[PDB]
Amino acid sequence: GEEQMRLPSADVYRFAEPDSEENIIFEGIPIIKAGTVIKLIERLTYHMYADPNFVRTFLTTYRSFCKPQELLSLIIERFEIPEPEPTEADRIAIENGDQPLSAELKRFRKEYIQPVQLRVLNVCRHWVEHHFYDFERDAYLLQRMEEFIGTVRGKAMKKWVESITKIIQRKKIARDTFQSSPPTVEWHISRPGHIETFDLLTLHPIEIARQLTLLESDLYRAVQPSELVGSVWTKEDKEINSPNLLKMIRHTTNLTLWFEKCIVETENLEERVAVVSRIIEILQVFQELNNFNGVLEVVSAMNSSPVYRLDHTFEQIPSRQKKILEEAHELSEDHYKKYLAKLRSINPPCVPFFGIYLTNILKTEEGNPEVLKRHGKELINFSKRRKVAEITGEIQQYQNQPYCLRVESDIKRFFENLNPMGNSMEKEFTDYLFNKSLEIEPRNPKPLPRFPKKYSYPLKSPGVRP
Ligand SMILES: COc1cc2nc(C)nc(N[C@H](C)c3cccc(N)c3)c2cc1OC
After folding, report:
1. Mutate which of 276, 280, 308 to test ligand 1's pocket (most atoms within 8 Å of Cβ)?
2. DSSP secondary structure string for all residues of 73-112
3. CA end-to-end distance (rounded Å), the chain
4. Is the Cβ–Cβ distance between 322 and 310 less than 8 Å?
5. What is the 264 CA–ligand 1 centroid distance (Å)?
6. How far apart are the C-alpha atoms of 81 and 78, rounded to whole Å?
7. Which residues, 6 or more positions from 351, have their beta carbon under 8 angstroms from its beta carbon?
8. Which of helix, strand or coil describes residue 373?
């Protein structure tokens, strides 16, 4: 029909081939279920309408099916639309030195070229505003973007070119508050500045929880949604594609293993009871601060193979502290049912539990195919990417919740530099922790031996009331 005849031919332009069962599948604006990358690019910059939901989802998840350099080449290719030849009558007009009517050329420029080109510029703008890290990780990509943007000509394009340049410059500059005063910083045995004495029992439990909550809040807020797409944190380029997520994972591993280390390396039973009791008090302050990430880190340490088996230690833990620990565990049961109910009911600020998102994204990545087949052709399963983007969107709704708590730089550095494993690998260190657990509390027939004290300071906690 004339609709396809008005569009450019497939021999000079790839984004005008008609829709079909073997290049695009759908789930007012239709929702894309699957398609070839060309059809995804076409609909990302569609001439009939804007689609901000799709633009946001595509730019969050495209690195799982298209490289940044390839996306830029494709949207530049999309932008470069050939114009139709003059009609026979207008050819005669041009050869006679007269102005052609150019009715179809003008209609095509207004109803197709200008909308598609403005839609490409809108993708460029969203890309530099929300995903500038692609340009920080690849200077050549930015050079190509600035060259493309800098050569765009048009009255209607001018405003778009300036906003894109403004955002890029604002991002380069960034690379190079509270209504009330925060509470008084709490000290226990260790004095301010005496970093050498800082430890689990010498720092105030309230302040350990406050400083770990600020540390974890900052780590949570730094994770970008694309660090979780396509399971890139479990792949080779994880250090470049997921630096903030890996920093959050490594913190959780170091903090959890440090709590286990403090517990099993305290051989004296009475002292180990004081250590465990202090870690439950730290969990109590994490609850008060709505740091669910911190609460579930303590749960993980208490449920670990070396700690969970310490029946002689938990026997001496007051019933009230055991019930607090049991209810924190129940946050994880029934697929984190109670945890999600608590998160949706609390008032900000909070630090959500990050692990649940990683688990659910891995389940979505492993349980859904990368491509869908239709008539022998492979289409990118975009609904899979949309589901991952919806989960990462849940992460983002809590990333603008700063805490009215004063940073204590020395305590902050103490927790940033925690290295319980030392030179050991994780598996070998956890085997050491379990073998250490068998040493301090041997299995049933072997009796419980007595061990000497290691702390030359009082074990009584100052409590959790500020
Ligand atoms: C079926 O498996 C489990 C059920 C649990 N049920 C409850 C209610 N709490 C648990 N753990 C909490 C955090 C806790 C309380 C007291 C002492 C210690 N050490 C840990 C559980 C751990 C389990 O497995 C590891």
Report:
1. 308
2. HHHHHHH-PPPPPPPHHHHHHHHTTPPP--HHHHHHIIII
3. 77
4. no
5. 17
6. 7
7. 213, 216, 217, 220, 289, 290, 291, 292, 293, 294, 398
8. strand
